């Protein structure tokens, strides 16, 4: 239950022409292109060629009021209007961008041209009207269904200003008469150009066939051409030109292959007439382990040049497993998932197989010492496939009571026990599949452990028969 065609687009925020231009890349490179939501009020700005913010500007874009579509200096004018702490954190980020990146990033007054006003009139964002006259200047009050801020725009230069309605106090303990709406801008050939929202890639799914291409034909043969230890070849080969990512300088953590894919995306938009420059500046969300973003909708462009939109996280996961992670395509998910993200402390859950099927094991007076915890013995590659599941089951039952039935030893608290007891349950199925593959309480009595393993080793080896 997703969305497709022009409909999925009308909700992706992406600019059609660019969207369209992306199909070509999706097919050609035969890979999936997934994007996060893109500020809708900023979609037209991108089309008009406004610059998009890179990782040097963490400020929050706005989706209401005049500043709609830009990165307000005053974060309380961003999508985070209200949310006292949200506003602040943003503000600090702007300040950092403005100071830590002097000359690169800056802030300029907001000038809504003639066309833009019209657009915001359609989106029912603001409504120009009543003329004003104060310090001998001509201003037009820009109307907004907001109750906290009262705006207006110069007629002499088209600058937008904003204060606070009658004794109406704002979030961060403030209040102020006609000010000026500053916006995050980057330096473009000496002049400061205002910024907008970029196109953030949720993830990129490249067909393994393509990941091969990425690999150097000569270096691949080195281990692929019947050297036969061959699997380890194609893997440690697939890892580099496929998995391994690395921190960049402007794009967060990205992979070589991805950088290329990136450039294609940007180049693609140019052919459309986009002057602003790049519109895809950083790595995929899947590498954003610091501050994971869980978005309800993810615009997806399949290698068939089609448009698909997810409606909820749970849904995106299915699509990714049904068409990507389970369809020969190279994929991986944000390592922070199913864990507490170090930055924003986000706990984003994602189906992870290595757990789904987690019913296995792994890390005088002789009991602590000896072979009682090495179930995984590499020297099992020679032992016939039968003796495998045969000696295996034993290695398991071997640990059934390694030093396990020490449960009621004394007072051994809730996890340890509930775990060794659970671990027990695991070994149970792990050994079950073995027996059940081709055959416990079906007949565990025939398994009496009192004598050393080397003793029953013979008894058991025949018990199953």
């Amino acid at each position: 239950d997703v969305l497709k065609g022009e409909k999925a687009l009308k909700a992706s925020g992406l600019v059609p022409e660019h969207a369209d231009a992306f199909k070509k890349i999706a097919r050609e490179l035969n890979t999936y292109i997934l994007f996060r939501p893109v500020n809708k009020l900023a979609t037209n700005l991108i089309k008009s060629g406004v610059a998009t913010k890179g990782l040097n500007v963490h400020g929050k874009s706005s989706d209401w009021g005049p500043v709609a579509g830009y990165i307000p200096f005053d974060q309380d004018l961003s999508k985070k209007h209200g949310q006292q702490l949200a506003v602040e954190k943003g503000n600090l980020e702007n300040k950092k961008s403005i100071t830590e990146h002097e000359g690169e990033i800056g802030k300029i007054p907001l000038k809504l041209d003639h066309l833009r006003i019209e657009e915001l009139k359609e989106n029912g964002i603001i409504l120009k009207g009543k003329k004003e006259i104060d310090n001998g200047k001509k201003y037009y009050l820009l109307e907004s269904n907001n109750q906290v801020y009262e705006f207006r725009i110069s007629d002499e230069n088209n600058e937008v200003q904003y204060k606070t309605k009658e004794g109406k106090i704002t979030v961060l303990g403030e209040k102020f008469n006609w000010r000026n709406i500053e916006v995050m801008a980057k330096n473009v050939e000496g002049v400061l150009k205002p910024l907008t929202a970029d196109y953030d890639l949720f993830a990129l799914a490249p067909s393994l066939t393509e990941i091969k291409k990425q690999i150097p034909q000569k270096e691949w043969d080195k281990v692929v051409n019947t050297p036969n230890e061959k699997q380890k070849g194609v893997t440690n080969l697939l890892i580099k030109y496929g998995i391994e990512r690395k921190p960049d300088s402007t794009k967060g953590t990205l992979s070589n292959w991805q950088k290329q894919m990136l450039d294609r995306l940007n180049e693609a938009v140019k052919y459309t007439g986009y002057t602003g420059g790049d519109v895809v500046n950083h790595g995929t969300e899947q590498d954003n382990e610091e501050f994971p973003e869980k978005d309800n909708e993810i615009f997806i462009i399949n290698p068939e040049g089609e448009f698909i939109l997810t409606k909820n996280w749970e849904m995106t996961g299915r699509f990714i497993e049904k068409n990507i992670t389970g369809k020969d395509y190279l994929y991986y998910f944000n390592r922070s998932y199913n864990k507490i993200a170090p930055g924003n402390k986000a706990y984003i859950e994602w189906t992870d197989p290595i757990t789904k099927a987690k019913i296995n094991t792994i890390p005088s007076v002789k009991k602590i010492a000896g072979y009682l915890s090495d179930y995984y013995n590499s020297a099992n590659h020679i032992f016939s496939q039968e003796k495998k599941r045969k000696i295996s089951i034993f290695r398991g039952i071997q640990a059934y009571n390694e030093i396990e039935n020490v449960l009621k030893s004394k007072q051994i608290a809730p996890e340890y026990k509930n775990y060794f007891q659970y671990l027990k349950e695991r070994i149970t199925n792990q050994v079950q599949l073995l027996l059940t593959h081709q055959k416990f309480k079906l007949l565990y009595k025939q398994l009496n452990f009192t004598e050393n393993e080397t003793d029953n080793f013979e008894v058991f080896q025949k018990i199953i028969d």
Binding site: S207, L208, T209, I211, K212, W220, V224, K230, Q231, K232, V234, T235, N236, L237, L238, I239, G242, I243, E244, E321, T325, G326, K327, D328, L330, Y331, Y332, R335, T351, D352, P353, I354, T355, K356, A357, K358, N360, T361, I362, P363, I368, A369, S373, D374, Y375, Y376, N377, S378, N380, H381, Q385, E386, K388, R389, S392, Q430, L433, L434, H437
Partner: protein
């Protein structure tokens, strides 16, 4: 760092007949094979000869720590491996199949025979369950 060290203060005790956490080069290769490693007899003294300009035979924890220190360097690339495994497992059942590994292979340009595949799986396979799980798969690169 914690997780970066607590990985030793949790195993350097189940195998030590000394009430002070001071062992010897005896179990040196025993603890390591219990922590995930699997070094050969050859690879034991050859390393405890340089950094260990002492060579007293009795090694405690302070020496044990400094040892596996820069050891977990490139060999700590388990992350990519784990993500690699999820690439093979198409049905996300937790194990790799023949049709899977074969599929993955027959896609990387290396057409494998319906015979060779089953051979590979069995290579790293330990349970004989006709499959390979992370616990096993990892062994493939740990060696």
């Amino acid at each position: 760092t914690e997780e970066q060290i607590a990985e030793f203060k949790e195993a350097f005790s189940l195998f030590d007949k000394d009430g002070d956490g001071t062992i010897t080069t005896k179990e040196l290769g025993t603890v390591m094979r219990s922590l995930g490693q699997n070094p050969t007899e050859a690879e034991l003294q050859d390393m405890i000869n340089e950094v260990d300009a002492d060579g007293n035979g009795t090694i405690d924890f302070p020496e044990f720590l400094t040892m596996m220190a820069r050891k977990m360097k490139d060999t700590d690339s388990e992350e990519e491996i784990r993500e690699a495994f999820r690439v093979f497992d198409k049905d996300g059942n937790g194990y790799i199949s023949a049709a899977e590994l074969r599929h993955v292979m027959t896609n990387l340009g290396e057409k494998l025979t319906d015979e060779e595949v089953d051979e590979m799986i069995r290579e790293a396979d330990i349970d004989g369950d006709g499959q390979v799980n992370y616990e096993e798969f990892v062994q493939m690169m740990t060696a």
